[PDB]
Amino acid sequence: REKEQFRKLFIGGLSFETTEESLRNYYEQWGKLTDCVVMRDPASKRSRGFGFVTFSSMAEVDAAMAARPHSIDGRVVEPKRAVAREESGKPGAHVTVKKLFVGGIKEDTEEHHLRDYFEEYGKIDTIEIITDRQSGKKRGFGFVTFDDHDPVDKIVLQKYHTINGHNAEVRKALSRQEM
Amino acid sequence: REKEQFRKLFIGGLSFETTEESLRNYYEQWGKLTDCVVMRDPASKRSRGFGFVTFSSMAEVDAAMAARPHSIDGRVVEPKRAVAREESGKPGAHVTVKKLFVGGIKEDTEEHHLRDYFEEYGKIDTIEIITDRQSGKKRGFGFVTFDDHDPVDKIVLQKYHTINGHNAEVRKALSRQEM
DNA sequence: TTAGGGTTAGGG
DNA sequence: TTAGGGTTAGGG
């Protein structure tokens, strides 16, 4: 079994009335939780408006995310795969995006190669293989845009992927302003 | 005089036809350049669509920025105070925003203290001193929003500022998702 | 060398 | 202790 970090969801935008009890009761519909916490101001004990749930298996996490949208105590919340504390301070660590950078694919990787690899993770809206506008050559990287952020979030938990005969690398796609 | 880094403008969105010669001819309207470069791909020599100019003094940089918008070889460009290479990899290093975070101002700093200190850098739109919503207590930081990004860019070239008798710290303002 | 995009972070 | 905002990044 994977360690808890890979079975854990960040639950954003909680109603300030939601409690560990009501958060647990909601996410238990997809399986047993090994942890559940609503984060609170230590001084006032007021809710900070988010928390975490940790399922007993990866399959349970996926089932919960497959059943979005989630409404708890009368507010629609935003569950996300938990980004590890060690990523704090990295550009884009907590940005939610639908686009993935793929590097290391050299000059023989075409759009369909990326599609064949990534389509099992989720619905793909577009793929871009970057080329040099003057030489025409492939530049050895591309982007995959999904219809939802969750495939990106899951994919980037594994940095290195074997694609089209290459040791490729994935990164969450960041705009110029974010990089 | 100041080091070149503080006399330097990043010029974003260049026409791909702009050359060092045409970039220089444009910016020399405001003073003599000690440096001018159009950045290119090392393999193909295609323009990357940006460059730098460095003026002989800080006053000349200010004069150029006071004369925006700038159009060069038929394209409107975006000049920006240059962000040092050493900032690469920090969240928000290259963000362009009108809003400034001000920390370290404790519980006795009011809007007018920030207005009095910052108004010399440019036109101020709004000032917010942040308080705890329930208690009303000042939380020791605030935000200054200007009508343009350039005052922010200039201000954050100096991290530490004395404000209302405090050692304060300034940061470009980021959304929570970017931190 | 593996950060685009007509979206804009560094050569010498 | 110095990251807001009904704006959502961690305590045990």
Curated annotation (Swiss-Prot), chains A, B:
Phosphoserine modification, residue list: S15, S71, S135, S175
Keywords in alphabetical order: Acetylation, Cytoplasm, Disease variant, Host-virus interaction, Isopeptide bond, Methylation, mRNA processing, mRNA splicing, mRNA transport, Nucleus, Phosphoprotein, Repeat, Ribonucleoprotein, RNA-binding, Secreted, Spliceosome, Transport, Ubl conjugation
Positions bearing Phosphothreonine: T126, T145, T162
GO MF annotation, one: single-stranded telomeric DNA binding
Modification N6,N6-dimethyllysine, positions: K90
Cellular component, GO annotation: Cajal body; catalytic step 2 spliceosome; chromosome, telomeric region; cytoplasm; extracellular exosome; membrane; nuclear matrix; nucleoplasm
Covalent cross-link site, Glycyl lysine isopeptide (Lys-Gly) (interchain with G-Cter in SUMO2): K8, K90, K98, K106, K123, K138, K154, K159, K172
Residues bearing PTM Omega-N-methylarginine: R24
Domain RRM: 7-90, 98-177
GO biological process: DNA geometric change; miRNA transport; mRNA export from nucleus; mRNA processing; mRNA splicing, via spliceosome; mRNA transport; positive regulation of telomere maintenance via telomere lengthening; primary miRNA processing
Source species, domain of life: Eukaryota
Modified residues (N6-acetyllysine): K154, K159
Changes after translation: Sumoylated in exosomes, promoting miRNAs-binding.
Localization per record: Nucleus; Nucleus, Nucleoplasm; Cytoplasm; Cytoplasmic granule
Stated role: Heterogeneous nuclear ribonucleoprotein (hnRNP) that associates with nascent pre-mRNAs, packaging them into hnRNP particles. The hnRNP particle arrangement on nascent hnRNA is non-random and sequence-dependent and serves to condense and stabilize the transcripts and minimize tangling and knotting. Packaging plays a role in various processes such as transcription, pre-mRNA processing, RNA nuclear export, subcellular location, mRNA translation and stability of mature mRNAs. Forms hnRNP particles with at least 20 other different hnRNP and heterogeneous nuclear RNA in the nucleus.
Entry's free-text remark on domains: The disordered region, when incubated at high concentration, is able to polymerize into labile, amyloid-like fibers and form cross-beta polymerization structures, probably driving the formation of hydrogels. In contrast to irreversible, pathogenic amyloids, the fibers polymerized from low complexity (LC) regions disassemble upon dilution. A number of evidence suggests that formation of cross-beta structures by LC regions mediate the formation of RNA granules, liquid-like droplets, and hydrogels.
Disease implicated: Inclusion body myopathy with early-onset Paget disease with or without frontotemporal dementia 2: An autosomal dominant disease characterized by disabling muscle weakness clinically resembling to limb girdle muscular dystrophy, osteolytic bone lesions consistent with Paget disease, and premature frontotemporal dementia. Clinical features show incomplete penetrance.
Subunit structure: Homodimer; dimerization is required for nucleocytoplasmic translocation. Identified in the spliceosome C complex. Identified in a IGF2BP1-dependent mRNP granule complex containing untranslated mRNAs. Interacts with IGF2BP1. Interacts with C9orf72. Interacts with DGCR8. Interacts with TARDBP. Interacts with CKAP5. Interacts with TBK1. Interacts with STING1. Interacts with SRC. Interacts with PPIA/CYPA. Interacts (via C-terminus) with FAM76B; the interaction results in retention of HNRNPA2B1 in the nucleus and inhibition of the NF-kappa-B-mediated inflammatory pathway.
Designated name of the protein: Heterogeneous nuclear ribonucleoproteins A2/B1
Protein species of origin: Homo sapiens
Gene name in the database record: HNRNPA2B1
Parent sequence residues shown: 15 to 193 of 353
